[PDB]
């Protein structure tokens, strides 16, 4: 399942100040050496409620948070990153990603 | 805008989603329940994000609103906000707004969030002089002249067609600026913004960073994906803790040597061969050095606090300097020339180990790394020292699994055969080389991969 994913651990302090959206980490697949890779995310906080708290820039793999977080409301988020070619074909197995909300 | 008679909620708020929301807000039971202006006058805040609202018709009657959230909706027309002058904060990111003329007279605004819309013309923001937070990224703005009088701004972003940063000259209250993904090459105006603490300028066309020299309050800087080479100016920015210079043309790291507050440093996809200047950067927990020209990575042994390290796509044979980095949790070094991984047995905290496209033949030293959750060992390759050609030439299979057992070849060239431990050919004439491949799924701890590769045997 690792394949060619390159992903740093993701943590966001609660009550961050703007400007939003705030860059968290840049996700990458080393499959990008053989063709363009496009990134997406699914999961609670991404494509299901609360929708779009986290977003990813499909061409750069920049994962971003769109609003302040509150650790008491939601202390963690489980997302999945996806990497596809220009033709819609996955070049990686989806990677489960944990987002920890800190102080 | 005032209701003069008791009116059904859904006759005020014509959008189905907003009528449902207002019903709850106004403490009513049915969307057809009646309300008066005295009921509406009590609404001073509204959190109506993520509700599939297409129209805010009816909000004009909520005369006492000070703070609204309509982010992540389907809004286009925002005319009903025109006369709500008590508004101080608007969250309206991720809608389909093009026309922001209705915001023109909301002079008490201190926060305005409009990123991810379809805005080009920001002239209606020009009188909003009380703004301290303004977000305009992921729009199609090219002209930022309207920002020139917004002299209380502290936090600002915009995009994605801006080339001329001149209107920022007088916004010296700026502390956090994000100009990523514009068409900016000239950042000379930033030298005026001496209170900047955070500057994000990824994916631009910047080659000259001399304007940053006097921005000594900077603690966070990202110039990822520009045209940087000479980074001499960075030596002035001694308060930097987070620095991203990936995807540039940098070779000389000497300017970074005194930046000892750095805890995160990204230098991937540059032209680096010498990392001696990083030796004193002992507070680093994250370091990215992938896609460079590294061979001698010995200075890395100094970086004892590293928990995240990338080294993939370099020219590294000797990985042993990383074995000092006992706190490492994630290590990526695919696409190098590493064969001996025995020193990595010392990385007792490792969780992710990415080592494909090296020259690894023996997994045994890794056997006790049972906390691994992610693993990559595919597509190894190496060339053996030449052996003498002879018709019945034979070589030992050296490929060893984590269990200590040899892995039988997947394929063998020239009709060759295997009987553990020996691969034997039966050649009719001289041939310059023979070869074999292997492919073996393996799990260490919870990390699964295919340990695979190709072994070339030259024949003299
Ligand atoms: Ca809290
Ligand atoms: Ca103000
Ligand atoms: Cl509310
Ligand atoms: Cl990189």
Swiss-Prot record, chain A:
It is found in: Cell junction, Adherens junction; Cell membrane; Endosome; Golgi apparatus, trans-Golgi network. Residues 5-103 form the Cadherin domain. During apoptosis or with calcium influx, cleaved by a membrane-bound metalloproteinase (ADAM10), PS1/gamma-secretase and caspase-3. Processing by the metalloproteinase, induced by calcium influx, causes disruption of cell-cell adhesion and the subsequent release of beta-catenin into the cytoplasm. The residual membrane-tethered cleavage product is rapidly degraded via an intracellular proteolytic pathway. Cleavage by caspase-3 releases the cytoplasmic tail resulting in disintegration of the actin microfilament system. Expressed in granuloma macrophages (at protein level). Expressed in the skin (at protein level). Expressed in the liver. Changing residue 24 to D: Reduces localization to desmosome cell-cell junctions. Also reduces the localization of DSG2 and DSP to desmosome cell-cell junctions. Homodimer; disulfide-linked. Component of an E-cadherin/ catenin adhesion complex composed of at least E-cadherin/CDH1, beta-catenin/CTNNB1 or gamma-catenin/JUP, and potentially alpha-catenin/CTNNA1; the complex is located to adherens junctions. Found in a complex composed of CDH1, RAP1A and PKP3; PKP3 acts as a scaffold protein within the complex, the complex is required for CDH1 localization to mature desmosome cell junctions. Interacts with the TRPV4 and CTNNB1 complex. Interacts with CTNND1. (Microbial infection) Interacts with L.monocytogenes InlA. The formation of the complex between InlA and cadherin-1 is calcium-dependent. It is linked to Diffuse gastric and lobular breast cancer syndrome: A cancer predisposition syndrome with increased susceptibility to diffuse gastric cancer. Diffuse gastric cancer is a malignant disease characterized by poorly differentiated infiltrating lesions resulting in thickening of the stomach. Malignant tumors start in the stomach, can spread to the esophagus or the small intestine, and can extend through the stomach wall to nearby lymph nodes and organs. It also can metastasize to other parts of the body. Endometrial cancer: A malignancy of endometrium, the mucous lining of the uterus. Most endometrial cancers are adenocarcinomas, cancers that begin in cells that make and release mucus and other fluids. This is Cadherin-1. It comes from Homo sapiens. The gene is CDH1.
UniProtKB/Swiss-Prot annotation, chain B:
Residues 1-41 form the LRRNT domain. Transmembrane segments: none annotated. Changing residue 312 to A: Decreased affinity for human CDH1 domain 1. One of its GO terms (cellular component) is extracellular region. It is a peptidoglycan-anchor. Changing residue 218 to W: In strain: F4233 / Serotype 1/2b and F6789 /Serotype 1/2b. Disruption phenotype: Deletion of both inlA and inlB prevents bacterial uptake by human enterocyte-like cell line Caco-2. Deletion of inlA alone decreases host cell entry; the reduction varies from 98% to none depending on the cell line tested. Residues 381-460 form the LRRCT domain. It is found in: Secreted, Cell wall; Secreted. Bacterial uptake is inhibited by EDTA and by anti-E-cadherin antibodies. Changing residue 308 to A: No longer binds human CDH1 domain 1. Changing residue 441 to S: In strain: H4. LRR repeats lie at residues 42-63, 64-85, 86-107, 108-129, 130-151, 152-172, 173-194, 195-216, 217-238, 239-260, 261-282, 283-304, 305-326, 327-348, 349-370. Changing residue 83 to D: In strain: EGD-SmR / Serovar 1/2a, F4233 /Serotype 1/2b, F6789 / Serotype 1/2b, F5782 / Serotype 4b and H4. Changing residue 257 to P: In strain: F4233 / Serotype 1/2b and F5782 /Serotype 4b. Mediates the entry of L.monocytogenes into host intestinal epithelial cells; transformation with inlA alone allows L.innocua (a non-invasive species) to be taken up by host cells. Binds to human receptor cadherin-1 (E-cadherin, CDH1); the chicken homolog of cadherin-1 but not cadherin-2 function as receptors. Interacts with host (human) cadherin-1 (CDH1). The formation of the complex between inlA and cadherin-1 is calcium-dependent. Mutagenesis studies show it is possible to increase the affinity of InlA for CDH1 by rational engineering of InlA residues. Consists of an N-terminal cap, a leucine-rich repeat domain (LRR), and an Ig-like interrepeat domain. This is Internalin A. The gene is inlA.
């Amino acid at each position: 399942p690792l394949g060619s994913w390159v992903i740093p651990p993701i943590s966001c302090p609660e009550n961050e100040k703007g400007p939003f959206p705030k860059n968290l980490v840049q996700i990458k697949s080393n499959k990008d050496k053989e063709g363009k890779v496009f990134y997406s995310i699914t999961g609670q906080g991404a494509d299901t409620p609360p929708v779009g708290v986290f977003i990813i820039e499909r061409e750069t793999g920049w994962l971003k948070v769109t609003e302040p977080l509150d650790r008491e409301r939601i202390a963690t988020y489980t997302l999945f990153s996806h990497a596809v070619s220009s033709n819609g074909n996955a070049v990686e197995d989806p990677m489960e990603i944990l987002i920890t909300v800190t102080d | 805008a005032t209701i003069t008679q008791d009116t059904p909620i859904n006759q005020i708020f014509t959008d189905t989603a907003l009528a449902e929301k207002m019903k709850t807000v106004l403490g009513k039971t049915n969307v057809t329940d009646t309300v008066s202006q005295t009921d509406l006058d009590q609404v001073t805040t509204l959190q109506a994000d993520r509700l599939g609202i297409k129209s805010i018709d009816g909000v004009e009657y909520l005369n006492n609103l000070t703070q609204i959230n309509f982010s992540n909706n389907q809004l286009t027309d925002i005319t009903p906000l025109k006369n709500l002058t008590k508004l101080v904060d608007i969250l309206m990111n991720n809608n389909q707004i093009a026309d922001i003329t209705p915001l023109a007279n909301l002079t008490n605004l201190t926060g305005l969030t409009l990123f991810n819309n379809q805005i080009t013309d920001i002239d209606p923001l020009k009188n909003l002089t009380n703004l301290n937070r303004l977000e305009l990224s992921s729009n199609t703005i090219s002209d930022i002249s309207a920002l020139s009088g917004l002299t209380s701004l502290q936090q600002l972003n915009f995009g994605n067609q801006v080339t001329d940063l001149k209107p920022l000259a007088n916004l010296t209250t700026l502390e956090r600026l994000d100009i990523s993904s514009n068409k900016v090459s000239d950042i000379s105006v930033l030298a005026k913004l001496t209170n900047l603490e955070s500057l994000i300028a990824t994916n631009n066309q910047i080659s000259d960073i001399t304007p940053l020299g006097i921005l000594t309050n900077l603690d966070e800087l990202s110039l990822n994906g520009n045209q940087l080479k000479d980074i001499g100016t960075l030596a002035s920015l001694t308060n930097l803790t987070d620095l991203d210079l990936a995807n540039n043309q940098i070779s000389n790291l000497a300017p970074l040597s005194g930046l000892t507050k750095l805890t995160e440093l990204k230098l991937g996809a540059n032209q680096i061969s010498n990392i001696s200047p990083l030796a004193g950067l002992t507070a680093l927990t994250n370091l990215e050095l992938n896609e460079n020209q590294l061979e001698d990575i010995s200075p890395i042994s100094n970086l004892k606090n590293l928990t995240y390290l990338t080294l993939y796509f370099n020219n590294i044979s000797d990985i042993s300097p990383v074995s000092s980095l006992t706190k490492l949790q994630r290590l990526f070094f695919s696409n190098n020339k590493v064969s001996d991984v025995s020193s990595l047995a010392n990385l007792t905290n490792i969780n992710w180990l990415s080592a494909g496209h090296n020259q690894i033949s023996d997994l045994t030293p890794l056997a006790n790394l049972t906390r691994i959750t992610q693993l990559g060992l595919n597509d190894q390759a190496w060339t053996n020292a030449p052996v003498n050609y002879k018709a019945n030439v034979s070589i030992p299979n050296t490929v060893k699994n984590v269990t200590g057992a040899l892995i039988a070849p997947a394929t063998i060239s020239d009709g060759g055969s295997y009987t553990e431990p020996d691969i034997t050919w039966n050649l009719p004439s001289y041939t310059n080389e023979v070869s074999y491949t292997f492919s073996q799924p393996v799990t260490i701890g919870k990390g699964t991969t295919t340990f695979s590769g190709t072994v070339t045997q030259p024949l003299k």
